[PDB]
């Protein structure tokens, strides 16, 4: 590495960012400002990057101390745990039907 080396031979500093979801709490988060929670209404929700649309209601499910979100047979999120409140919320898809 001499300063007169061709750009193809000049030194370049490289940084590689790899993102990881583990079997553990998500602790790295973006700067996006959080908002208050609304229940029993159709909303566009983003829980820790888990995005979707539906109605958030109080659940009677029993997540284990680690479980963050549930799923349905379709592989869709059926319920979640609020990152700011240790409560479990059921997601009901917004009412729809043929016209």
């Amino acid at each position: 590495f001499q300063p007169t080396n061709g750009v193809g031979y000049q030194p370049y500093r490289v940084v590689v960012l790899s993102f990881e979801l583990l079997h553990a709490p998500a602790t790295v988060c973006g700067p996006k400002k959080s908002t208050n929670l609304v229940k029993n209404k159709c909303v566009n929700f983003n829980f820790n990057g888990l995005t979707g649309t539906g109605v958030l209601t109080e659940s009677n499910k029993k997540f284990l101390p680690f479980q963050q979100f549930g799923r349905d047979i379709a592989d869709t999120t059926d319920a979640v745990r609020d990152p700011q409140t240790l409560e479990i919320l059921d997601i009901t898809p917004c009412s729809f039907g043929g016209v």
Partner: protein, 43 residues
């Protein structure tokens, strides 16, 4: 990543593992990156 699941249960038996079924729930996930091929116990 070293994942550690565990389960505690009362027993009354002095011979060997009681027969039955019970699931172990995860408790720890250590981001060690330490390669492992052997282990040992300490009593």
């Amino acid at each position: 990543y070293f994942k550690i699941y565990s389960k505690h249960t009362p027993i009354n038996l002095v011979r060997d593992l009681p027969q039955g079924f019970s699931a172990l729930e995860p408790l720890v996930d250590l981001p060690i990156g330490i390669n492992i091929t052997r282990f040992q116990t300490l009593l």
